[PDB]
């Protein structure tokens, strides 16, 4: 909407300053952090489930740190 | 229009072997060419002016809602029908509310109500398109002759000096030769069809300011839209809300203006100036340049006979070169102006090269000033001004030692590789073997792959590398490099390219 | 105010053993209690009125930007400083632009410019808060006496009939007894402190309409905000844009109004009516109700002596019960009105129960009408009206066979479990053992866990189950059920609870 | 913003119709679909990488169908 | 109204033990009850009259199409818009045709055209619905007294004879007692709510004739439909065709009338008579019948004193019984009419039973005729026409040997079991144990399963059995019977039930 | 349509003659036969494929005689 599916960014040609760059680089981190800072309990039980399955070590972490991005913005 | 002081300025080392060489220029940057026996040339974009525009579709980002009306029906009486469905000037919505004897009806539990209301635009958005035959290019071109501090940036003079000229190019007049006078004439060969895809996207206007936007993205805007002229719209509900149906009485309300979200939405869009026409800032344009009739006037003149002077003090270009200004006492003008770039006063052997070959005293009038630039080499040196006791000289550092240049060269190329795509190989002008295939390679390689999963945003593709990396991290020999090329490069670098 | 025809209507089976029993009522729903020797009672929320409000912070969702000014400086001259920094009425931003001799300065490549502009609000948002001592509850209460079709829904009459009353409850007057007259008086015991957390969230107003919003969420709004009264704001840049600095000339522009996004943003907010005060729709309130002084008038009266009639025809409540209207010819009123609910005319043994016990002829005036409801059992039956040849009767189906009831009971509970939390066990009134512990169990269990990772939205938690399921799918025995309880339930059901 | 971190939804008490429910249920699907319908090439190479790693079958799919949600809205 | 000669006629063996017994009657069939000390009773449906009807939705099966118009646009000019979209009286369709310079436009390959045309109904279909309180039942009832050939079928006389009566029953008057005079009075107890589901389906009218159809099926119909009254329709394209767009000129054409397909479509629909009201043919109705006040007049009279005669010769009912007509010479009437049914003239012991108990001479007038029926047993017998020499007798075969009759009854029972569902157990009147549970069993069993995959058509379910059979054919012991019950029965039989 | 999804048959209550019974019983056979009598070549290659797979004998035939009904009316 007016919200989601921002054209940002076309980003062709253009050596210059884009409409809002400073916002854009900062956007994706915050709105996720704000939510995760909120309900950390989520991450706790989340992280556990990663260590549960696959037992190959690091690839387990691959689930978790990934999964932590899932809950933000569904 | 000159290359002086533009934040981004590059040079070109003339390989001889032709009077012609291929170029690509950009909105901001200015290009400067030095090739033997040939003066130094300046070319830069001015702007991109398009003339006539066409209007694909429209949008109403903020709308009004009035004339609420609703018609109830008893249960089992089926759907209600409001007459206002007879006009597209309304949006009708059915509905139903539970029903008692206490209100109006002889059975319990259900009903039908038909809500309708008029629909009208507060203020609306206009898209537009560009037909390629409406394109232009304003390109000024410049050569370094006698200049002062004042006239230099100014276009009025150099017209008279005939050392600079402006012109338009179109697909209708794809190439032009134009006379500088004394130095001869030169020839530009360009490809207006290739500057943009006029059909890659649209001109969009929201309120005042206007924007370039991928026509692709531009369809899926969720909002009331309109046939090109025309009348009345589709999907015109999404600005309205239906409350809970309450007996006969339900209200419908318009959302607040969405105008902000648009501005919010637009990021990659590029500001433009739209009234009757549009002026781009950054152009992308390929051209070829033919230097044959270019020659060197002044070879007649001899050494100048009198003292020199420094009007302005030496200063740096920031691009690795140095300009100074000289005023000259004697009247012998026009005369050839002795200067060089030297290591120690114990040597007269020049080392660096003149930016402008053969500084040229304009006139016999005393105390004229002359603007001249050179490129000293690394470390320490002097600037020899004149010969004999009169000779005065200045001592101008540079810290630039070669290696750091080699790097800042590379990455700059690397950046100029990115976002310039296949065409980026055009810096490799008079190609073949290496350069010609390097564009051929990048052609299908970049024209696919990187652009096939393209549409990624920052971390989206930025994250991918690390995820890819772990594959390269844990893999099998000779499978590694195949996967690794995917992992590193092509991705992380542009991720670093954007810093910011 | 009655329970008639409300879309959501439930009954309560009086367990005797007390004149008191515990209740929880809701905005929409209406509750109806039948217990032996006691009439039938109606209680429902009217609304929630709060009185005095306080204003935490503010927001300006749409702002104006004027008075652009900027002050350049030469390179190496450090940061520029515009005087306007002396006032909070401006936003100043520094900046820098590359610099030639051609413009104004004696060295190349950099500079400093200080841009400032005035900042002002187009239109702004107001938050507000509620202090619990300002709460009210309007609760009407009703008992079934003689009624007509008209008077029934109407509050004017039943006041005179003394069969219904309205009242307010506060933490200041947490419980009240109130007289119905003839039937005696009854006692409500409630807990205004528990209705809401007045501090769980805020009242928010945007333009006209207003909304309840988690004060938690409400802080992190990204937008200009203000100290409570007051003057001038923080973070007031985010409505403005700085263009590319161009020499001395840079422009700053305000974004379009953000008002829409707010409306967009708000979803879970609940519409409210705000002028001086607020009126909620859906309340959540616990109460206890004491019936001792409630008794049955009319036990004196004998059988009515004359023909009956049907003013309105039998019809269904949709909740599983049936109302009819009767008019009565004779003048013997007041007299006791014979009726029952029977299987076949070969039997006079009643089966179902009267909704209203002992229909009561109001007056001796002929052709008065009487409004009466009963609950026939499943299948087929009759309605016996009167005895003797005069007796007329009607034949009213119901399809409702017991099992489907048992289910639609359960899920309805299940729904009423969800979103009613621990308190949902209050339907289990006069608890202990099972019910008391069932609230104790859910207490820490729901007060943690489901609410600890709470803040999920639809698929967010909705997806989780399937992902969880695969764990239950592939697991070890006796580990399965432990994991499975996580997988299914508590999650998917509420995911189904929302359909829609 | 006005866009992201919608209060939607508080959703307490309230048996009634919420401000906009009909939108909300429909929102999250579309703005993702719109984007994925757009550049399907993404999903192709995406799905492959899932089958690459972990070789436990279905848990590989767990990555993919998950990963397909990642690229929408970053 | 009598049971005489109706193609389908059944009897009921009075079990005594009550003056009441339960019945179910049908449109065509007529029921006849013989129970000791009680005369013989006749009850049959007359018809089902419903009074007031309501109109759910409509259909236009044949429509007109006029006022073709289309507006072209050049390529890249987007969608065309015809003004006629401003009215629901048209259907607009966009379109596009490739475009040359030769026609009208400055680019090649595409375009836009907007076709619109007016839309109107040739002739339309009307659905209607029935509200149960509008139901009736005309039931005539009859008892066998003195009759002639003429009066018997005729309703005028038997009114005077008071041996037959017509009446209406509604849910408003669900049961009635009514006087036959001399024999006393009897009591019907019925359940109008259960006759049909008035909401199971709709009354549909197409042109003249009208039809009963399922409610769910009506909604699906693919064709223009309308809100209940009202104006203008949905999906109104499907009667129209768009040709190939040709330059500016495209034509749209209406399909031929669909009226036939409707008639084609309707099969299971049942013909009805619709003007203001409707009259069903086949009713399905449950009733109970109370015989107490029924008694036997005539027990006073003695043997008749004179010769008998045969006006009409003995003849068969086809249901297994035999009627004859007698005229009587003497004047002694009223007198009791001696007759019996005997094996051989060597015996006076009766064997069969009288259809009508105690034939009754009406009057003293000579040569009156009397119509009487009996049921002789199997094989050969005689009809003794009163004792005494003057006794005349006739010899009337029947071939019906007990096993054949029993086998025929079983086949009839299966048909009764089918299409009469659970209710079919009502033939088992004064139930309990066996019969009561047999309806309870069939209840959930038939109310699910057979009706759950119901909606099969002939071979659809007809084929299934054989496919099922092979499962029973090849299976495991104790799995066989479980599968076999699915295979055979419940399916093949109704498949045989329909022959035809 | 007017063609397909005939209400035929409701067939409740009704001991009597239905609107058109004689047609209905005869309908389904003919319109299939007409088509199969037409292109018998279909059935040939059809029947073979049944004998191809499953090799349990009669259950192979189950496919065929079934399959022969498929092609009529798609």
Residue numbers in the entry:
A (entry chain D), D (entry chain F), F (entry chain B): 1 to 74
B (entry chain C), C (entry chain E), E (entry chain A): 1 to 500
Give the article text:
Here we report the cryo-EM structure of JEV strain P3 in its native form at near-atomic resolution. A final resolution of 4.3 Å (the ‘‘gold’’ standard Fourier shell correlation = 0.143) was achieved. The cryo-EM structure of mature JEV (P3 strain) reveals an icosahedral virion of ~ 510 Å in diameter, slightly bigger than DENV2 and ZIKV (~ 500 Å). Three E-M-M-E heterodimers lying parallel to each other form a raft and 30 such rafts cover the viral surface. The structure reveals unusual “holes” between two monomers within a dimer, formed by cooperative shifts of the k-l hairpin, and i-j, E0-F0 and B0-C0 loops. These holes are surrounded by five encephalitis-specific motifs, which have been proposed to play a key role in the attachment of the encephalitic flaviviruses to their receptor(s). However, JEV (P3 strain) failed to close the “hole” under neutral pH conditions, perhaps because a number of residues highly conserved in the JEV group, including Asp28, Arg44, Lys166, Glu243, Glu244, Glu273, and Lys279 may, together with His264, produce enough electrostatic repulsion to maintain an open conformation at both low and neutral pH. There is a notable hydrogen-bonding network centered on Gln264 near helix αB. It appears that replacement of Gln264 with a Histidine in the attenuated phenotype of JEV could further strengthen this hydrogen-bonding network. Residue Glu138 of the E protein, which is part of motif 3, is one of the points of greatest divergence (in terms of both sequence and structure) between the encephalitic and non-encephalitic viruses and we demonstrate that it plays an essential role in the attachment of the virus to neural cells.
